[PDB]
Design a protein around this ligand. Sequence first.
Ligand SMILES: Cn1c(=O)c2c(ncn2[C@@H]2CN(C(=O)[C@@H](N)CC(=O)O)C[C@@H](O)C[C@@]2(C)O)n(C)c1=O
Ligand SMILES: C[S@@+](CC[C@H](N)C(=O)[O-])C[C@H]1O[C@@H](n2cnc3c(N)ncnc32)[C@H](O)[C@@H]1O
Ligand SMILES: [Cl-]
Ligand SMILES: [Cl-]
Ligand SMILES: [Cl-]
Ligand SMILES: [Zn+2]
Ligand SMILES: [Zn+2]
Lengths: 301, 116
Amino acid sequence: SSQAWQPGVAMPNLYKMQRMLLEKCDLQNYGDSATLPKGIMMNVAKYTQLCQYLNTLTLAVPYNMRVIHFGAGSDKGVAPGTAVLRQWLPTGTLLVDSDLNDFVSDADSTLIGDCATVHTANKWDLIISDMYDPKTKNVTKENDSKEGFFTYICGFIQQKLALGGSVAIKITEHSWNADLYKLMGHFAWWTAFVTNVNASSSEAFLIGCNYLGKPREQIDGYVMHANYIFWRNTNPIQLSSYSLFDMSKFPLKLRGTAVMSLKEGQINDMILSLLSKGRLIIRENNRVVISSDVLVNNENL
Amino acid sequence: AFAVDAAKAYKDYLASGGQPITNCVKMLCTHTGTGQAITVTPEANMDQESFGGASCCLYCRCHIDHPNPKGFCDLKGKYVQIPTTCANDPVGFTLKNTVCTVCGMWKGYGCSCDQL
Ligand SMILES: Cn1c(=O)c2c(ncn2[C@@H]2CN(C(=O)[C@@H](N)CC(=O)O)C[C@@H](O)C[C@@]2(C)O)n(C)c1=O
Ligand SMILES: C[S@@+](CC[C@H](N)C(=O)[O-])C[C@H]1O[C@@H](n2cnc3c(N)ncnc32)[C@H](O)[C@@H]1O
Ligand SMILES: [Cl-]
Ligand SMILES: [Cl-]
Ligand SMILES: [Cl-]
Ligand SMILES: [Zn+2]
Ligand SMILES: [Zn+2]
């Protein structure tokens, strides 16, 4: 009912607990579009509602926060999502973004190329991914767990996500990965969030809230994606742009979350409890250094 | 002694009836902000629209060097407030106009430093 005035809808817990079999996704309002405010792009509206929902979770927001944004380029050559993230994040937050093709961005640093070529010395407090290949929308072929950039994302999380950090990874009916669902169980909380502006799409953002670096619960990713599609298939979401008109509480709150360097032996239950509540980030606070691998070739003769 | 002059090229292209650069990233905001020209977060007032800075910079958008000898961009990483009446061409607006270094408002679009 009041769902239309929320930024979107999150997958209810009871649907996470089912053991469904994967079916084709059939959305009641497929093809319909929400009425965006005059001159607002879909991607600005999408990212705005994503951030509005993230405002309701227990995100760690330390001083000198570090955020990386994969799949940040549009076919228009600009970065709408990055612009919203920078608006949302506290001023001064280090924001890196990346995409396969060249684009102009407001991020502090931009890396062009396949995400597998991206390397960083440091860990991150928040990872956003809108990476997507629309050639996965082939209804005539079986829908199996996908690899590609999902394999990179899973490894990047386990290797470069600070404990206490969070992620939001875009998925669809066909663009998904079982290990990523399983990785959601390594956070204190997780969900699949559907924006109200794009409710006619099987798209969702898989959100992991406060990373713990170890399985808190065991999740079968093939079953959980089937659970997600079942939820989508039986719960029509009313397209709505209502929340885009109230931006008074949009900025992410600079919680000044504490950052500590700690070693696997020191991570006790007191620490794990603080991590689970969005009250602690564990990583070094050194300088942020990134790079893009470049393949070298001489094609003469 | 040869440097391409993109600013003049866009001005002539506009004068001769060319479509302004599109896909400038317009932000959602309250439109109760300070109204200043270039800010670290959207600051549009009731009579402005707020845009992502890089998307409104001629040099960023055209993949050409910035006139700053250091190559530094005034807009990238920030947000530019455009008068709603001119929002059909943010790149053209930021090119043709100047920010008052005293009050931070656009000269002739909010700057009253020169009034008495
Ligand atoms: C590729 N793809 C779809 O095709 C799709 C879909 N949800 C529903 N459908 C179509 C809808 N449909 C149409 O005719 C549409 N033009 C609009 C409409 O009527 O809903 C016919 C209907 O029988 C069911 C179905 C499955 O075929 N999702 C999430 C998706 O990714
Ligand atoms: C629709 S786009 C992102 C839209 C963008 N977030 C915005 O706000 O406009 C999906 C992106 O995923 C990118 N991308 C997809 N797969 C990738 C991969 N393996 N490696 C690097 N980039 C990828 C595509 O190049 C594509 O630009
Ligand atoms: Cl499960
Ligand atoms: Cl550690
Ligand atoms: Cl252009
Ligand atoms: Zn620029
Ligand atoms: Zn002035």
